């Protein structure tokens, strides 16, 4: 009579069990943390300035609905009981969507700083929630079959089988195999490869950095989310009858899936230490809110002060010396004798600017992408504009303003002259 | 704001010796390029001095190199300009001004032609 | 909880060719599993086996063993 018999798993499931749950509470903790704090940072006392900060906002969002679901699915696995048909198929719905997002704005950084690396091409934060709203809803729509078809059945919310084809669960391996995994790792690869080959020949003083930030984006995707892919080719090949599987290999697989699944679980927790909290000025942010023998690089020359009576006009000109293409905004800072530093104009290369409110009005600012250069048309000059006029340049993913220039004189009063002679 | 204001003053024939006591009111002149500049009667104005923040920078005219000798000091915020063996032709009135030209970085250097802003309203140095 | 990592309790890998209406004493509906409508078939021998509901021979087993195994009816 002998034939395959059924393989058992309660053994597998009972030691597993403490581990997911474990895990979940763990990524639940530092994964809602950790991202709260990326849109309290971009949001809190401040203006979305860049397009970046646009979609780190986005996947920190994505973030938060992933983990925001990890307690309800907490109460599922302490008892089965607790969780109907209808409300795990839209709790379903949010893991798939917000899945889908997270991976579909994590390829957005890439795009987004490769066309603006090597191509020039800047976008305005008026376009990045644009096409925010475009990934969001191309990740809804993409998700569709995914969670539309699991249910509860038997007391199991599971992927209604027997409504399907026996095809399905091949091509919905498949699909999110290279839909998940392949393309979205193709992509930032390719862009953060060419960023970097650029980026090391450049004269930018951060360019080393730049190289490791970006080859630990590559390196923490691939060591969170390759095993859980790399279970299910193994996963699929069972099914697919190329090889061959008996009940104890079924089990070593289960295993591995479980476990391999609460670790691709933790790289949503990780996204805020890979993209925001990796820069400077994101570090120098969060403390003022949390309340606690050469020449090097590119040098900023600055040209265009002098002396002008009161209503007068000047044009003071800034540009980089250097051959350096991670710069994405530049600004003009003043202080005067015995005072502090204080913004008075601040233009991105995605044409958002940005004044103080005692200026506004008066000065005009304006650049050049092609030659890396911003001058500020100064109009109607008051003697209290009397101050040293500072450049200064921020440098992307690196998030760095340590590029300043010499500093230009610009006096408005009724002075007096004397030629010492 | 900064105004500056000069003390410093007298009549004394060729050969003696006065100080030109220049403080400052308002703010304490720890960060400006502080000069002296005088301008006999019906003449132009000319530069004579010069000190800024900086030690070792220091600026004197071609006539009276050597004669005057200026120095800064942060007591009641003043800085000093002895005046030794007089000439009837410093017969003038001296101003204390701020120089407001050649920033190279920090410090004001002082410079020739600099652009004076805050001054006092003179004293007389009869000779 | 992503694809294939969910926890099933029973997975089936093939089907019995035939079981002999004579030999079952049971057949429990899955009351949790992995893949496709799986039935257990508990022999004589207490041995279990996994067969396909959509046959024949098993849709008649199923009326035979749930018409004996009804307590004392
Ligand atoms: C840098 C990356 C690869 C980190 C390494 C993660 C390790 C633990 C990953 C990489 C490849 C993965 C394996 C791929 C294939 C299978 C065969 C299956 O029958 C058991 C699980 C098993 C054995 C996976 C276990 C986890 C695994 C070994
Ligand atoms: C960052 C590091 C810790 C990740 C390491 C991955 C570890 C925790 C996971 C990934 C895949 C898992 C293995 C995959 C499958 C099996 C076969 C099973 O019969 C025994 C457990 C065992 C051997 C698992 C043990 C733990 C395991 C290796
Ligand atoms: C089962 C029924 C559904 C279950 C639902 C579970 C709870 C969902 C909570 C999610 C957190 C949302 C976090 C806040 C997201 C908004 C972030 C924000 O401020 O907006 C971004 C901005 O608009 C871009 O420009
Ligand atoms: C609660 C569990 C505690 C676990 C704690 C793990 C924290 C380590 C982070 C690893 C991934 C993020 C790595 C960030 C990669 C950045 C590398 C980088 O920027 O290099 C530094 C630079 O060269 C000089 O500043
Ligand atoms: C087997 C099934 C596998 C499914 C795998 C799915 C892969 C999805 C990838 C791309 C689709 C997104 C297309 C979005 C097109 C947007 C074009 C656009 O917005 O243009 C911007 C312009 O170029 C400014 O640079
Ligand atoms: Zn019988």
């Known amino acids: 009579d002998e034939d395959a018999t059924p393989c058992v798993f309660t053994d597998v499931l009972n030691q597993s069990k403490p581990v997911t749950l474990f895990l979940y509470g763990v990524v639940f903790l530092f994964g809602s943390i950790g991202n709260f704090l990326v849109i309290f940072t971009i949001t809190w006392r401040r203006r979305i300035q860049c397009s970046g900060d646009v979609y780190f906002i986005n996947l920190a969002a994505a973030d938060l609905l992933f983990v925001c679901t990890l307690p309800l699915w907490m109460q599922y696995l302490l008892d089965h009981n607790s969780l109907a048909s209808v409300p795990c198929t839209l709790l379903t719905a949010c893991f798939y969507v917000a899945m889908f997002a997270s991976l579909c704005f994590i390829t957005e950084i890439a795009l987004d700083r490769y066309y603006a690396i090597v191509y020039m091409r800047y976008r305005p934060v008026k376009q990045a929630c644009l096409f925010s709203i475009f990934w969001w809803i191309f990740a809804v729509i993409i998700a569709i079959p995914h969670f539309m078809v699991v249910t509860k059945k038997d007391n199991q919310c599971m992927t209604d089988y027997d409504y399907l084809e026996v095809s399905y669960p091949i091509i919905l391996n498949v699909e999110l195999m290279l839909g998940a995994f392949v393309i979205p790792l193709s992509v930032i690869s390719y862009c953060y490869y060419r960023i970097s080959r650029i980026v090391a020949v450049s004269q930018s003083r951060h360019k080393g950095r730049i190289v490791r930030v970006l080859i630990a984006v590559v390196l923490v995707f691939i060591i969170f989310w390759l095993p859980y892919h790399l279970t299910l080719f193994v996963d699929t090949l069972k099914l697919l009858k190329w090889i061959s599987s008996s009940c104890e290999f079924e089990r070593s697989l289960k295993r591995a899936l479980i476990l391999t699944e609460s670790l691709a679980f933790c790289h949503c927790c990780l996204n805020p230490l890979l993209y925001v909290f990796v820069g400077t000025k994101f570090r120098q942010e969060l403390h003022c809110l949390l309340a606690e023998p050469r020449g090097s690089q590119v040098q900023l020359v600055e040209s265009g002060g002098g002396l002008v009576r009161p209503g007068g006009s000047l044009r003071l000109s800034c540009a980089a010396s250097g051959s350096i293409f991670t710069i994405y905004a530049m600004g003009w800072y003043r202080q005067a004798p015995g005072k502090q530093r204080e913004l008075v104009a601040r233009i991105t290369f995605g044409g958002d600017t940005n004044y103080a409110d005692s200026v506004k009005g008066r000065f005009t600012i304006s650049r050049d992408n092609a030659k890396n250069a911003v001058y500020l048309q100064m109009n109607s000059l008051k003697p209290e504009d009397t101050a040293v006029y500072y450049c200064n340049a921020e440098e992307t993913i690196v998030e760095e303003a340590d590029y300043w220039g010499q500093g230009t004189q610009v006096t408005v009063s009724s002075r007096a002259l004397e030629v010492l002679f | 704001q900064l105004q500056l204001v000069e003390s410093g003053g007298g009549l004394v024939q060729p050969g003696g010796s006065l100080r030109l006591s220049c403080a400052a009111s308002?703010?304490?002149?720890?960060?400006?390029?502080i000069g002296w500049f005088r301008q006999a009667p019906g003449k132009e104005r000319e530069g004579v001095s010069c000190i800024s923040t900086s030690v070792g920078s220091t600026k004197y005219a071609d006539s009276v190199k050597g004669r005057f000798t200026i120095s800064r000091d942060n007591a009641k915020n003043t800085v000093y300009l002895q005046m030794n063996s007089l000439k009837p032709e410093d017969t003038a009135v001296y101003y204390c001004?701020?120089?407001?030209?050649?920033?190279?970085?920090?410090?004001?250097?002082?410079?020739?032609?600099?652009?004076?802003?805050?001054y006092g309203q003179g004293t007389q140095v009869t000779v | 909880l992503l694809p294939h990592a969910n926890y099933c309790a029973i997975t089936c890998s093939k089907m019995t060719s035939k079981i002999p209406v004579a030999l079952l004493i049971h057949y429990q509906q899955n009351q949790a599993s992995c893949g496709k409508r799986a039935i257990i078939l508990e022999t004589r021998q207490h041995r279990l086996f996994c067969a396909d509901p959509k046959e024949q021979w098993v849709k008649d087993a199923m009326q035979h063993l749930d018409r004996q195994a009804a307590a004392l009816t």
């Open positions: 001004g701020a120089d407001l030209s050649t920033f190279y970085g920090g410090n004001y250097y002082c410079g020739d032609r600099g652009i004076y802003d805050y």
């Open positions: 308002g703010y304490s002149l720890e960060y400006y390029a």
